[PDB]
Amino acid sequence: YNYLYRLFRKSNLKPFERDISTEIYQAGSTPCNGVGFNCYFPLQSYGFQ
Amino acid sequence: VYAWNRKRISNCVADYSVLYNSASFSTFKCYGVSPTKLNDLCFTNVYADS
């Protein structure tokens, strides 16, 4: 689980853009206020086996 | 669950935003598609397995 990729972003990356941000992603129409369901942490792992 | 009931949807308009915005569900997940993109798409059939 040491390897990671970004699952969500509010806009596409530009060419050779790099982004370390871990701010919560509002997937629904209802605001997240920095904290869950439809309010997702944006980095996930392949869990390689 | 051995006899799982399938609905086939055809010739109809299917909203997923009522499904993903609803607080009712203890889990919601998607594979091969973004959940935010679903409402823009069109398909020959849609299936719901229950």
* A chain contacts of residue B23, beta-carbon cutoff 8 Å: 37
- Cβ atoms of A29 and B21 closer than 8 Å: yes
CA dist B43 → A37, B8, B10, B46, B47 (Å): 28, 12, 9, 7, 10
Q: Of the candidates A27, A30, A37, which has its C-beta nearest B36's C-beta?
A: A27
* A chain contacts of residue B36, beta-carbon cutoff 8 Å: 27
Resolution in angstroms, to 1 decimal, for this deposition? 3.2
Token pair belonging to A8? 């969500």
- What 3-state DSSP class applies to B4? coil
